[PDB]
Structures are given as C-alpha cells and as structure tokens.
From a paper:
The majority of traits controlled by rhl transcription factor RhlR depend on PqsE, a dispensable thioesterase in Pseudomonas Quinolone Signal (PQS) biosynthesis that interferes with RhlR through an enigmatic mechanism likely involving direct interaction of both proteins. PqsE is a thioesterase that triggers transcription of the RhlR regulon through a hitherto cryptic mechanism, which we identify here as involving a significant chaperone-like component that enhances the stability of RhlR via protein complex formation.
Interactions between PqsE and RhlR do not involve the autoinducer binding site or the DNA-binding domain (DBD) of RhlR, suggesting that complex formation does not directly interfere with the ability of RhlR to sense C4-HSL and bind to its cognate promoter regions. The homoserine lactone moiety of C4-HSL establishes a hydrogen bond with the side chain of W68, whereas the amide group engages into hydrogen bonds with Y64, D81 and S135. The acyl chain of C4-HSL points into a hydrophobic pocket of the ligand binding site in RhlR, again with high similarity to related structures. The complex is only pseudo-symmetric, i.e. the twofold axes of the PqsE and RhlR proteins are slightly shifted and skewed relative to each other. This leads to the formation of two different contacts between both proteins, one comprising approx. 850 Å2 (contact area 1) and a smaller one involving approx. 310 Å2 (contact area 2) partially overlapping with contact area 1. To validate their relevance, we introduced alanine mutations and investigated their impact on complex formation in E. coli coexpression experiments as well as on pyocyanin production in P. aeruginosa.
Author numbering:
A (entry chain C): 1 to 241
B (entry chain D): 3 to 241
C (entry chain B): 1 to 301
D (entry chain A): -2 to 301
Amino acid sequence: MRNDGGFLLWWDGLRSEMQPIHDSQGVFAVLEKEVRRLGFDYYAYGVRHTIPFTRPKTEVHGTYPKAWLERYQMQNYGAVDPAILNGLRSSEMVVWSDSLFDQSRMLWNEARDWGLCVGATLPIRAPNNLLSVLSVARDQQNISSFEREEIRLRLRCMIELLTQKLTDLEHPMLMSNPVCLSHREREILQWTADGKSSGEIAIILSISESTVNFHHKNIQKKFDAPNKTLAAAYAAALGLI
Amino acid sequence: NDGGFLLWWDGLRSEMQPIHDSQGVFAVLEKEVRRLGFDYYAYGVRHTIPFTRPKTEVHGTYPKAWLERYQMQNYGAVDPAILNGLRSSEMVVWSDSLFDQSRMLWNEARDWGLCVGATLPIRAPNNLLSVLSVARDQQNISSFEREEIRLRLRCMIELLTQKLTDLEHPMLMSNPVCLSHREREILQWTADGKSSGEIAIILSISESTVNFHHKNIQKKFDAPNKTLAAAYAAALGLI
Amino acid sequence: MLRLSAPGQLDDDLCLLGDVQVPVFLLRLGEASWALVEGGISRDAELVWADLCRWVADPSQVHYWLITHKHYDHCGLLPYLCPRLPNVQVLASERTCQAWKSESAVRVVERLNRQLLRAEQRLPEACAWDALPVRAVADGEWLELGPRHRLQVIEAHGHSDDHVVFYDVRRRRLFCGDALGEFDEAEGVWRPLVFDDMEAYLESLERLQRLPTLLQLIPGHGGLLRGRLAADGAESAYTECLRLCRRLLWRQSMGESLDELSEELHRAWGGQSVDFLPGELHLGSMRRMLEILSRQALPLD
Amino acid sequence: QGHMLRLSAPGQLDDDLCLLGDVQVPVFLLRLGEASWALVEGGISRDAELVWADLCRWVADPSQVHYWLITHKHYDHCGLLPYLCPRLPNVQVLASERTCQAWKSESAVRVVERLNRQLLRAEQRLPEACAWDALPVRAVADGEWLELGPRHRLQVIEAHGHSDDHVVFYDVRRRRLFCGDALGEFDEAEGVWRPLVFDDMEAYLESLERLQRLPTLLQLIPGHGGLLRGRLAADGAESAYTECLRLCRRLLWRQSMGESLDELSEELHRAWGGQSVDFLPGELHLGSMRRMLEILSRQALPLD
Ligand SMILES: CCCC(=O)N[C@H]1CCOC1=O
Ligand SMILES: CCCC(=O)N[C@H]1CCOC1=O
Ligand SMILES: [Fe+3]
Ligand SMILES: [Fe+3]
Ligand SMILES: [Fe+3]
Ligand SMILES: [Fe+3]
C-alpha cells in the first residue's frame, strides 16, 4: 505494498500484503494500519446474524476502548445500533450524525463520551445473508465530503477483502453455526420449505415416508430444532437451501 | 489528491442521480461498459424462492435470440456465473474450467460471440442476488485491466442496484406481503420453534387467537402450513 | 525505451506520417479501409504523400479524416491532400467546421503555414475551404471506424474553444493533441498550453482522468508515450497547470509583471517548438496563457 | 500584521510570536506568559551573539526562557544550544529521542561542530560552550502534548524522511505548524517547495501525507524563510508532496535517457544552491543533492 502512485497501486499492494497471512490477528493488524493511514483513531468490525429472529446475534471486534465494549455488550446496544441497522435497508455508507442517532440517544451520548465523536459505518451482506459492517471513528475532525467519498471507496475495498480472508480462515465470529446437510437432506429440506408434506416428498424422491421422516429427524437434530418449522426457517435464513 | 478513480466515481454518481427512469440508468451502464472496451453487458436478479425453481430475471444487451434460447432452456437455473454469487463475492473471469459442468450453455454462448467476459455478484439488502456481466468477442482479459475492471464493476453494480431499488423496478420487486408488528412477532416466535401455546403464553393472549393469526399468515402466503410461511419469511428478510 | 518518436508504424495498426513535430496519423481499419487523424501543415505535404506511399498501396481507401481543432499546426493540409481521397468524410466539431467556413480564420492559418516553407519548396495544388467533405460530430459520438477500431470523441475545450480528443477503447489509446500541453522532452513533464479558457482546460483534463488507465498517449507533438507517462498524463498535466498558476500568482504578489514570466518562459521553453512556431508567436502565446491564468486563477489570503 | 503572504523580517510576527536572528536561519520566540517564554529551532552557531541581542530586546530576564523546541539533529538546527543554554538556566531542550541521543554520539556532534565552525566571519570569536551530553534535555515522543503555556499547547508529530529523527510541532490553537525541513526549502523566487529528502522517501511522503490531514493551517513556519500564511500555508503539505513526486518523475525520465545522478545533481545545484550560500557550503549542498537523487532513484516507483 500500500503506497502512493494511484489507487490501483494501493489496491494491489493491499492484496499482496494480505495474501500470505495465515493468522486472523495479522489480518486485523493490517486493517488497523490502513485505517490509521486513512486518518481515524479507532475502527470496528461487526457481524449481525439473522437468527434468533427475536434476539439476533450481533458480534463485534475492533479497537474501540474496551470499557466501551463492556458497556456496549452489557446493555446490548448492538441490537438497535443505527449504524448497523442501516445495512439491512441500504448498501450506502453511513456517516455518523446527530440526526442518524435521534432514535438511540443514549448510545450516541455514551459513544461521544468515549471519544467516538466523529465516524462512519459501511455495511455489506456476505453471500450467506450475514450483515457485516466496518466502522471507523476519530475524536476531533468532522468528515468533509471529498474525504467522505475517499473513505467510502477504501473502506469498501477493505471490508470486502477482510470478509473474504476471514471466511477463508473460518473465524469463530463469522462461523455462526457450522451445519452441513447431505445432498438428500438438503433437497428434502428444499421440498419441505416449499410446503410439501412427508408423503409428497416420499412420492417425489421415490423413497418411503419413513425414510423421509427419519431424514427430518436427523435434520432437526443438526439444527437443535424441536420441529421442521425452525429447521426450514433457519436454513432459509442461512442460505443452505 | 487521492486517485484519479474518484473522478470517475463522482462523475458516475452525478450522472445517475438525476435520472428518474430505469431506461436512462441502463443506458448509462451501457455507456460505461462500452467505454471500458466491452461489447455487451447484462444484469441479472436471482430470487431465493421457489427453492427448487428459483426465479432468475435478466435485463441487458445480449442478442434477443440468445435470451430466447436462455429462457427456453432455463439456463438461469444452472448458470455457473450466477451460481458463483451464492458462495462467493469475488469476480469470475469466464473460462472453460468454469463451464465444465454446464458445457452446452458455454458452447452456445461462444457460438454467439460471447467468447470473453466476466461476471461480478453482489447481495442486495433484501436477500436478493444481483449480478453484473460484461462480454466481448476477441480480446482476453489482461491482468491490470482485470483488477481495474473488477473495481469499476463493483462500484457500478452497487450504484445500479441502489438506483433501481430507489426507482422501484419490477425485476427487483418481490412477492408483496405486509405483516403488522403483532403478527410479525408471532412469526418471529414460531420460526424460533415456539408452539401455539408457548406463543400464547409469552404474548399474554389466547391459543385460539394465536392459531387464528397463523391462519391469517398462511392465507397471505398462499401456504399449506406454517413451515412454508416461516421459510419464505426468513428468506425475504421480513423477520 | 519509454518514448516512441519516429515516422512510420507505431504498433500493429497505426502509422505516423510526416514530421513528428506536426504529425499525421494513419489507422488501418481493415484490409481495404484507412483513416487519418490531424490535419498538419502545408510545409509537410511533400513529406506526407511520399512517406505515406511506403505504407498504403492505394490512396483511394481513406474514408475518414479527424481534426482535433482549428490551429494551423493541426489542419493546414485540407488544400493539399483532401482532393485526392474522394471517398473521405472529414469529421469535426461544429466549432472546427464553422471556423473553416470563416475567411479570417483560414487567412490566419494560411499565413502561419506560409511562414514555415523552405526557400526551395514549391506549393502543390490546393482547393477551397467551404467545399470540404465535412460532417459534424458530437461529444461522446461513437465512430465505428473499423472492426477493431471503435473510437469515441470527447470534447476537450480549454486549449481552444473547440479542441476534441479521441479514445480507442480496445487499445486504451488516447489521441489528445494539445489539451494536455507540450511534452518536455528533456525533463519529462507537461507544459500547459492554455490559449482560450483555463477552467475548460482543467475540466477537460478532469473528464479525461475519468477514462480507463491509458496504455498509449498520443499528443500533437513528440510522438507516443507508454507506461506511467500515459497513465497519469492528465493528472500530471493538471498538476503542472496549477503549478504554473501558483508561480504566476506568487510572482505577481511580489510586484512582477506578466512580461517578466513570459520572457522567462520563452527563454526556457521556446527552443522546443522552434521548427514549427515563430519565436515571437511563442512569446505571445506564453503571454496569452499567463493573462488567462492571472484572470481565472484562485487568489490567496 | 500585514496583507503579505510571507513574513520574512526579524521582529514580531504575531501577537505571541517573534523571529530572531537571520531570517535565513531564524529562531522563533513564543511568549507563554508574562514571565515565561519558549524558543523554537536551534539555528546555526555563528548567530549566537546576534540572536542573544535580539532576544534581550523582548525578554527582560533570560531565566524566564523555560523551553526550547528543536526539530531535528542537522547542524543547522541545533548549533546554538551549547553556546546559549549556559545563559538560559531555566531552559529545557525538547527533541526526539533520536535527536537527543544524537547529541550523545561523539561522531554526530563532531560533524555538527565542524560544519558550524566552517561558517564564521573571518575573525569571529566563538563564546564558551558546554558539552552536548550536558544540555538540559527532555526527550519527547510522537503525539505528546507539550503544556508550554496556558494558551500554548503544542503537539509533537513524527516527520521522518528528511532525516531519521525529524519531528514537527503543531500549535493547534492557532493552527500553526513549525515544520522545519519536513516540507523542504521554500523557493523564495518561485513560490514552490524544494524537496529535501536525505534519509527515506517513503517516510518523507508518508509524513507529508499525515500532515495533509491536519486542520487547515493558518501559519506554516519552516526552518528557513520565515512564516507563510493564508493559502500558501494551507496547502503546504500537498504542495510539498507534489513537488517531491515531480522531482521523482524528472529523475526517472532523465535516467530513462541514460543520465547519471551527478548530472542532475549539478543541474539542481546550479538552480537552487544560491539560496543557502550563507549557511551551507556549496560542496555539502551538491552532496545533499546527490544523496536525495540516490534515495529517489532507489525508492521511486519505476515506469513500466
Ligand atoms: C458494528 C459497528 C457499530 C458502531 O460502529 N457503533 C458506533 C456508533 C456510535 O458508537 C458506536 O459504538
Ligand atoms: C446473469 C448473467 C449471467 C451471464 O451473463 N452469463 C454468461 C456466461 C456466458 O453466457 C452467459 O450468458
Ligand atoms: Fe493547438
Ligand atoms: Fe499543436
Ligand atoms: Fe535539516
Ligand atoms: Fe535545514
């Protein structure tokens, strides 16, 4: 590499610098280096899962003050944090602003107290329907528009490559829930999630109904589910069917 | 002072925001595609349901006969360039190895001159799979242009999906279903494995009311049971 | 090397005809189809037709002639060679054609071209200006010149009120004329040539930065540039234009006149364009550029 | 005050800032309070008796000089310390740990002493001097806040590149930046920056990058030439970056034609050396040109 001569040079340098990395800590380290190269003090990377639908998991990892992470998870501010929730509705970057936080005033006041006075947040959706988010923050300088665009671009590149490398390294934060379905079980679940009954699946797949119900039992066992509704819903949410 | 690419980005944004009709958006897309050096482009939207026969709508500038053939043989189902987006967000350069599983599609596309090309996937904020392809006939993709392209295509598909959603295009539209907070919360609980009685207990209402709400939801989804309703709601990002 | 500079074939498809100072460019669209770019001067027709003979077997297969703008060093061959390529469509911006239609502009161009002949050279045949095979083109118009030549036109006002440039998208090759300036052969940087409007000049350089990364950059003087020089050509031209702006404004803040820097710039630069530009006109053009800059430059506090 | 864009005259420069000595190698004086003062830049040795005189016009007591900020180790920015610190009992010299330890390395102090001793006026009589390792020094770090005075809170910023120890001082209240040679030598005749890369070009450019990010500057004070103001000081860092890359391109082009480093060194000397004849022997200026050209040829990005 990340250098000066052109943006494409920085892109290729970042790629080559990140290719040999076999440890997630070093990946985050390169990310932090480039973030500070951009001009901000702290950064953060958040993963919002789709389930449980009532209380969806929102994991976070970054370089905000650890006391702020204590408070953030203690009061579970991550549930209704506008910077993250924007990604459910837009592919655009979000620059932190008072108007944005009119809904969650306590979180914004506490973040300002911890120095997170200026910042921005970029969301993206992984190909497995996860909501990944990359936030940057500093204390004293507001974001101008030209820097807004510069950031938007560089952060997009960085979060894309980061999610790619973290999927390649099978990080626990992104692993969500490791579940593998067999071809037979996956197609049976595809048919069930389309509304077909056990007997209709038995007819279609040219197998017995006892076999189909035993496959349902196995599938429920994998999802730790009590019935087929939970299994089908979580599979649809996780992109397994 | 931070890259001449920013000039192109801001120019594209300024050119595409004042447009209030999708025709002009696609026209600007073709403008930039041809400016890069390719002949044709395409934009595809793969929906998540039906899981067995997923909808794959398309709009672009390939020969109309080739699209007729494409939909006739439902190539949208097992098109590798599209299916890459289900498991990866990285760009795909067209190559024989990519099409070894669907050789007929690749052979016919080559017959149509679509000999060189690439396809970039992205996930809309509504669990839809959008994809942007570019293609030419005679010149293979060089390396530095490979990366430059990749970046430009990423930017363009991002802004295109944004502007088309803002323009409420039918290709991006999905099955229109609206749930109230109460019924949506009931479905959230059901899709989490709760039974009728457990939901009635939690929401402090009767079980007859909960089963009547289940009937309402299935009636809207044209569903035979609650499994289909829950699965389609999860797939559509409604819960 | 890093700079190509010689008459003849540039790459697998193109040729540079005539003088590298006032060169013409030849596109081989197909087996039996050719096109031209830049109108050059009258002083080089005697070199044109001949050196052309080495590459083209039949002159009748020239179908297009592209002109960047109306300056004498990029247009003065219409009387010389146009009559003998009957199936040729000159393609030019409305400004350029209308200038060709005016008597005063053609008189200026004819005088400036006459100022460059040799005491032995005799003038070949000539034709009229309003009788040219002209066709108006527009900004962004796509020229399907050949099966492997799809070039787009881009309006690059600034150096003049009509300058336009051509981008081959397939080879990422940009013919820019003077919109970027005069390439310094000794130092490797750009010399601004703002002779009409500075804001239009800078905005044109911007719009050109929006193109894909360039592999080949072809101005009106010097030849062809490859590698980094072609990539950041517009960026560097913009930077050097602003550098000259700053120099002029600083010198003016110390109580110095435009004449000072005009004479200095003549001394330091005119040596490059002595073969195709009377020195007095070089000084006058330096002064014109400095006046435009002093008029449109951003002040200081 | 003044309408001008560059203040280059000994005397008062601002409500709290004065320039002392020769404008070529100035020493800047800050009034922290009624009886508290601070110095910036170390200047050259032969100006000792001059600076002192000027200093005494402003400060009624030398004991009120409490701090002395130094940018880097080069001879032309710390030659006054050994001669004038004995007269400033209450002074703390503030410099980077690399600079502070340089004042301990026999060889570096010998180089400093030789180069400063070579710039005397015929029969100049140096005043007594104290040891370099005896100076009242307190090392500083990157990003430290120096609580000089109630209305003087200056931040330290690492500006490596020009040297392996260069640092700069940002008075954030007044958006004032003492930048030393981190941007280079200002061309008084043309209004542009002359790159002064004498250690590492990557670090030089990265430091100029980081400095571009500071709040818009109102006062830009390099080690030579005085004080810049207005738009000239606002975009100083970006302009230095641009001029450095311009010289890079020029060097690379001249090499693509088959030139040597020393040809362009001679050219750059003939074009620039005239400004620093009073405080820099010509041979050392030519050597610095050759060294910067070496570093640029090594670390510049080729053209292929
Ligand atoms: C996952 C990203 C969340 C994030 O950046 N939150 C910021 C917003 C303001 O205070 C915070 O903690
Ligand atoms: C949705 C777009 C998919 C696409 O353009 N695929 C390409 C691969 C080769 O022939 C095609 O049709
Ligand atoms: Fe011209
Ligand atoms: Fe010209
Ligand atoms: Fe120095
Ligand atoms: Fe110095």
